[PDB]
């Protein structure tokens, strides 16, 4: 997906 950072792992 390519998420904006670590808070969505």
């Amino acid at each position, epitope marked *: 997906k*390519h998420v*904006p*950072g*670590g*808070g*969505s*792992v």
Partner: antibody
Amino acid sequence: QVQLQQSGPELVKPGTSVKMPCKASGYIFTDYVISWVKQRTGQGLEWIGEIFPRSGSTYYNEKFKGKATLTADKSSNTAYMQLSSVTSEDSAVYFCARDYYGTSFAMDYWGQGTSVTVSS
Amino acid sequence: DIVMSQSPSSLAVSAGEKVTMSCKSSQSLLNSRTRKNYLAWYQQKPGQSPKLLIYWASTRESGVPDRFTGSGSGTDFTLTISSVQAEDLAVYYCKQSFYLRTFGGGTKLDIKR
């Protein structure tokens, strides 16, 4: 031996565009994001934005939306940043860094920086 | 859109002394599923591009001496250098990757002699 290669110092005239390359080697280019970071003389590091070369997806720091445009050429394993309509606020050193997306989420290898001086 | 603060902004110690420096985020950097704080520490020497020291708050990156120790959680983090060396002269930055990325203002380390 992961390595990120950036172009030499540049002088650009105010109002113009500058496009600088960051050539990656030693790893799978498409498995890590490339972050870009600005540093004004004597000042701190300021995050600009990132690109995922696999997919071309980008995020930006709000301050750099429509000032910076990040792109990536998978055939050459090279990332580019474009600063548009430059002003003396853009005179700075701009690093690219490999950014371990999905795991560490850190920037583990850096380029040497491209020193941009915007002046007449 | 997480703001980061570092303190103190400047610091002097003699070779061999212990030093600690603090880093604060406007939000928790802790993600419940992974159980990791997305906080890293970087060292920047004069004429040099930044080098990653520590990620996930407290994990040393390979090649980094063990005297550099990262610690803390949520919004309050610490880098400690036990037994500072003359080579450690640098500015130390913290940075958040919980959501986008944000560098702290940096803490400059000067050596007394």
